[PDB]
Design a protein around this nucleic acid. Sequence first.
DNA 1: AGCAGAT
DNA 2: ATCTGCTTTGGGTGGGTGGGTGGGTTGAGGCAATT
Lengths: 300, 212, 426, 162, 664
Amino acid sequence: LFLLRHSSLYDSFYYSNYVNAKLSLWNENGKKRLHKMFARMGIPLSTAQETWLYMDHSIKRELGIIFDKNLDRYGLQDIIRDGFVRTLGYRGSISASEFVEALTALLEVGNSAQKLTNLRKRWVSNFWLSWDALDDRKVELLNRGIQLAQDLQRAIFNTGVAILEKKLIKHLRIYRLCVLQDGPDLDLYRNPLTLLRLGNWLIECCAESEDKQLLPMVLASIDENTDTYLVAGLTPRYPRGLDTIHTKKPILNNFSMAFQQITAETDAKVRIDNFESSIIEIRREDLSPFLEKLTLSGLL
Amino acid sequence: TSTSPEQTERVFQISFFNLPTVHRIRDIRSEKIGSLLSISGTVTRTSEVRPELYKASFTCDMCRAIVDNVEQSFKYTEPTFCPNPSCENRAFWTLNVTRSRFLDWQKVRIQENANEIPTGSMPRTLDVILRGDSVERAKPGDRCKFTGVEIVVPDVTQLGLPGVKPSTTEGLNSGVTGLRSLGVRDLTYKISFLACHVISIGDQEVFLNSLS
Amino acid sequence: DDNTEIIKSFKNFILEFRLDSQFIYRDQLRNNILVKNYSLTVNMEHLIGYNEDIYKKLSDEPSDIIPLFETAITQVAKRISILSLPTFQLILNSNANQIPLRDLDSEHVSKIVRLSGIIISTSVLSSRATYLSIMCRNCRHTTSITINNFNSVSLPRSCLNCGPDPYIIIHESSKFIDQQFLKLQEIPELVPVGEMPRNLTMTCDRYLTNKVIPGTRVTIVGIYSIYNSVAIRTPYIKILGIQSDVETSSIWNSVTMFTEEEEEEFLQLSRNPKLYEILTNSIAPSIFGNEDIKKAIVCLLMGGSKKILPDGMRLRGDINVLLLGDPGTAKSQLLKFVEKVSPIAVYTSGKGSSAAGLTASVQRDPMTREFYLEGGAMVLADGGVVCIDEFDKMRDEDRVAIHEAMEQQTISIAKAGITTVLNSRT
Amino acid sequence: AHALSPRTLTAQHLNKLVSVEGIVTKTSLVRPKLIRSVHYAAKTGRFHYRDYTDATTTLTTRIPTPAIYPTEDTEGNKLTTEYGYSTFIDHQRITVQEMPEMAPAGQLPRSIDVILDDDLVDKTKPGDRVNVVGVFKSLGAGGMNQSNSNTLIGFKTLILGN
Amino acid sequence: IDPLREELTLESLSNVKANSYSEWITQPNVSRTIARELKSFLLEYTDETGRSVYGARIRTLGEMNSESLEVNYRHLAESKAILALFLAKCPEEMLKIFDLVAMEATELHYPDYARIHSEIHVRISDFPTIYSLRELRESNLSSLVRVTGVVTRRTGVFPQLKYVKFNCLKCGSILGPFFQDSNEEIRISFCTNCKSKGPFRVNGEKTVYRNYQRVTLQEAPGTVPPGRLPRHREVILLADLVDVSKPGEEVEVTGIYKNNYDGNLNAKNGFPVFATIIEANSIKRREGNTANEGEEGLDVFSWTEEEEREFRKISRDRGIIDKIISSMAPSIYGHRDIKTAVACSLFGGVPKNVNGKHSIRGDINVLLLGDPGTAKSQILKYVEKTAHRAVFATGQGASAVGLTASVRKDPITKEWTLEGGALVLADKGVCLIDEFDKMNDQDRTSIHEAMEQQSISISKAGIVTTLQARCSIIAAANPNGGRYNSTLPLAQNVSLTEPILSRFDILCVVRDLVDEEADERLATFVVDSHVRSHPENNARQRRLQRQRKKEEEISPIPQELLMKYIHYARTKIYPKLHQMDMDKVSRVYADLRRESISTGSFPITVRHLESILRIAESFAKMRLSEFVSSYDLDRAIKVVVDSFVDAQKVSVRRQLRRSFAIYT
DNA sequence: AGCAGAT
DNA sequence: ATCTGCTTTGGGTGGGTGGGTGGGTTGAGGCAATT
Ligand SMILES: Nc1ncnc2c1ncn2[C@@H]1O[C@H](COP(=O)(O)OP(=O)(O)OP(=O)(O)O)[C@@H](O)[C@H]1O
Ligand SMILES: Nc1ncnc2c1ncn2[C@@H]1O[C@H](COP(=O)(O)OP(=O)(O)O)[C@@H](O)[C@H]1O
Ligand SMILES: [Mg+2]
Ligand SMILES: [Mg+2]
Ligand SMILES: [Zn+2]
Ligand SMILES: [Zn+2]
Ligand SMILES: [Zn+2]
């Protein structure tokens, strides 16, 4: 669940990749199903929306019992897990997953070639905020990171809703494609980390499920300030928590090889300087030829 | 369909009309109290129909006994002696609205007709009480002809009511006293009426059936 | 029995709570006793962190445990300030979700709640008893009573022959505290469809009195309780904390509520070479053009300076602005923004107003049958700005009723015996 | 620090000598107040007397004395009140209001009730600016008697002027 | 076998073996049988479709965390007649049993629902017999009744004691809790143990409270005989029913007619007359729905889970945006522009608060300025019928404070208070003003602030407050001289001024011109309509089928389904502008301004630039689409540009139409 | 204090 | 025959689930109809 101990029990379910994948919360039927689940579990809607610290303690203590019988019915059974929780005397206890989420959020939104250099300098600056957040003498930074993480997850949810409602995902035979051109919050996705966050959200919902064949996905976003795309190939993922011989085998990311081959062959003007070779930059007018050649390559 | 359990006894009413003479409001005196006569006047105000307690039925608070057919005077009345020999309750009862019988009740205010008013004189007024099916038969502004019994209604506040504290003529309207219920207070009276009859002086298949 | 253990538990929180190397509550208490502020503000997130059991008791039965946390505070204060002092007040801070004013019902009786609203009226301070000295009419026996202001108390009915109610209070030996009443209205946006805004009565004690003025948005932590005035009770909220965005205390008295760190920010901003441009651009960011009107609004918000000459004449220091123009110009939007930026402001429509609605009105108290004065828009906006929209729809008389309050900044009344000259500097 | 105004008078100042400044807005009518009554027993040929006290005629709390004149002596003799030898004093109540120009921003001025007895009875009229010295007190049971079911009303307060 | 656990059968339940129905129902075995039968009815009842009604009604109940299960009287009457009879005659005990059984049925679906709400209240929906407040008699006492009236006075919500516990003053023993009857107080005179005549103190360690409210019902002016005074009764609304009804609204109250002893009434009348009240069991808002009386349920604008799985098939089809326009007042022959404007106003735009500092209106206002016999008032009446909350006002029958809000002195507290007017009653609704041009100027100028800011500001008698009036205005007016003069500009043909005109998003000018072919079609349609509406032209099923067949001829979508669809779209859908041709809108706005520079032309301001976007959002909403499409913006631009062109004079109309042909 | 009731 | 107990005047130190056909009556302010 997304930041269980720093938000309401409702928000943790609402803004969770797995829950949204298994319930399709992006449409009204999903919200109805989630409300049905909460009603069945015996948690009043007012109680669930209350923040974690002040929630009624009977339900907080019984959460393990209430979750275990109820979750299997809705297909959300794998939410149950064992993790690491660290407490400093008389302070709130925080888990490893939420700490990592706070650090990542601080990295992402903590705060021609000239603008690119400026953006990279800003990210290098954010590195030190995230590094400071690792010291127990700096807890305000960690709280600031949790707040920013909640904001970022809300924005990613809205963008994914806009993508899925419009059916912007084109299902080709070699891969899936999704290009953003006029979104409301398109300034956010210049950072590779936020773009990968949105990519993971999409990969889990309506791509991991639906009993569809595993197909790699390409996600691209535009920024008017520089008139270029930030393409990002993403590896497919097997259904979560489904141990199997085929699931045991790992899946590699071949987009680096194909991207390099196409860039060398075509006069792409692609930038392949990012450490993650699957992420490049393309000019506004080269994406169509690039994707045509990608489809015709067959090495994806 | 089903066997109805609630078949109580009808509460009949006798209505008389066509009396030899009709009296004006100004001609009502105290010699005719308790007698049957007709009067004429133009209605001016009508109250709302309320349920009036007729045959109250109580239950003893201690031995759970029952008392039925407790005739009601002008004020709320309760039994004074339980029918259970072992019981000692005398002044403790609880009403039972399931077994109690209520009658409809409306208060109509009438005043003498304009043509009968002596010139430059304020009108006289009276309060008429209707019951049963004679309710809502008089609308304000109508010129009706009631037929009932002229009665006198005591000031129930003095007589002693549960939960009520007791309490033109420059102090000369002194009532009668000395009654057991009236400790040191007096009982004053009013002239009223109890009408049993009211007369107001002032689709193809269905229509055909009406005609002779 | 259990009371002593509860008191012991809350005393150990004030003496053992450290988040790093500073005892937050022990030091807060000493610093408060040094300036004669007998209270302690405790954050409920810190109590949920020390021992969750103490929070469970304080939230399960608030009007029984809060009185036992006050005596613990008093004992610790005596231990810390006196080398071998009234009962200390406990002010609470919480981050729990706010319940809408109209969602408070039977399910929240005798529970700690957080809510927001607008203060519409404040009462004259009353005096509540905290330590009575009593005596008997017949045998003249002396005794004392101690009262906490948390209701679920009266003089003894039988003496300690002496008839019923034999005790009379000895006033010159008793001690009292301050009590105030407030009316809280729900925020205009929260109101449901087609409903008038609803009120709620509130009471505050000691150091929570004289903290708000009518017309200011506040956040309240308190206890939703009931008092009998048949089988129905009139609800009310017993305030345990007040938080507001307006420094009313600074506005009524001197300069206050600005930290040196906050004050340093203001000086730094003032040193900006182009503060005028920033302020002009900051007004109505969503309205295009109209730069001159925005500069005029900046000047109006800033105000001039008022002078009192030796002979007594006073010179107005406020600026009045009129916007005449064609439809669609965004005058109403500018007025609605100015109402929202100014520390004190009232938005009124000239059509839905009256001479008494503005200025002040004479009202009769139904109980005492005595006339008193209630302030209108220009009194409620005193020290701020009044936004009179639809100024052309106002009637001639209601408009004429504004000349003196606009120029002389006073509201002369001579009605129903009441004769005064209020102050309206708007 | 006891120089105050009707707005600054709070429960902390009760049972203390204070000086208050403001405008006189109201003034009740002057009515005599009974303090001592003297009677004569014709048969015994000796005078008797009785002393009455109230909450506003003295600074120390005493048992209330109803104003009923004694009628029978201790031994049962008839008593005739001697009004010419009894003692009555005048009594008036005024209200002092805070100066309007000294009020806070957006608050109407407040007022306090004052009692003047004997020679201080008619020294002020409405519309006068006064400085009153007296003792700040409280009266009554203030809802502690079971008759009043409010449970949220305070005590009455006022100043006995000197 | 324990005798107390034995049960009878239904036919054995029909034959009564007691002296009263209450005593018959209260018996153990009879109560067990009644509870079993009610549970069977809830579980097994199936409508025509064949799917359980109350299983779905319980599922939705749990979804919303509500504590009220609405039961139709007709369903119970058909399934079990004897139980319906018992509920009609002895409502208290029957309702108690039905609440217990309903809680047991709800717990069937949600095993732990007792942790959300302890009890579930059954609400009766359609009682066949309707009384007035004049027709209530003694025979109706202690029996279920259904009455109508106007809520003239309301009280605040007070927490009432559900159980009262008493303790002896002398003995000190504490008597057990006793149920509290809202109608009258409960007192204990004879103590079981102490047996002391003295009063017992009221005290309790712990109690559970319930909401309590009282309203004064008054006879609606429509039903009271003309010229007579109206009767009134008092209704007691217990928890979950408080604040459902508001002052100045019509309502249909189902409840129990109860009487109790009143000493003061006996003292004033002189006879032992009791006081009567109604214990509400359900409320149905009858305001502005005089033409929807032919409909089941306590809400006629609400949906099942199956009716909104189809409001979403109807809406994917390609021409819903135009089958909706067709279904607007189908009994009116032509006037396509008027119907389009009415549909746009009904669906309305999306309000938006930019950064919490800028407020932008999100509702569409329409003005019909036409000739005498051109079906304007009929359109207004139809809009009144269809809207969720509507109020109808006529020119000189409305006042400045009748609209908006007024200030009165409460008769009880003798203190100034605030009352809501038409626009408050039309919050999130429509205010329909007829004879708009004959209004008083003072009354007309009152709605200026409400028509744009969506709020009413009152400064009167010490009250300084701002209300919310989120209402759209559809006004009908008559041009100067009674007939539109197409040779003159619009400004000369109406007496309104620029500020009021600029607040109307759509202006529809209607003209009556004698064209023989046009007269031929209109007369044919009108005569066919009069033939169709003639009164002469299972029983309920047959009536519904014939009504459906008659309705299908002129309306592609059923009117009731259309009402539910409009309500659903206005509640759940908030379209957002993401992808739009900015240049197109900017260029049409500039063209409109330049062409409107002419003297006497219809005013053009930024309000109309925003009206274009509002209409586009409305069109997107008509399709239940979450994003505004290019086609919607094109259609909105066409609507605005046409409405602008039609208002021009004859001389320049051809030139204007040629110039603007690009966008239409 | 006068009058209304229980032992 | 004695002991136990409630309630006034009229008034806000009973109230507004008792109301204004049970009395406490001028002053101000808002609204419709009259102009
Ligand atoms: N820059 C702007 N200039 C003008 N109007 C704007 C601007 N931005 C938004 N608006 C719109 O202005 C409308 C508000 O009306 P506005 O305040 O302009 O009227 P007004 O001219 O003051 O009043 P009236 O038309 O009654 O004379 C809102 O719909 C808002 O969307
Ligand atoms: N286009 C039309 N289609 C159907 N009926 C019409 C049409 N125009 C007028 N009518 C008829 O006119 C009558 C209503 O006139 P109305 O609209 O009240 O006049 P006004 O426009 O002055 O309010 C109705 O009976 C209606 O049948
Ligand atoms: Mg405006
Ligand atoms: Mg018409
Ligand atoms: Zn008995
Ligand atoms: Zn004693
Ligand atoms: Zn007992």
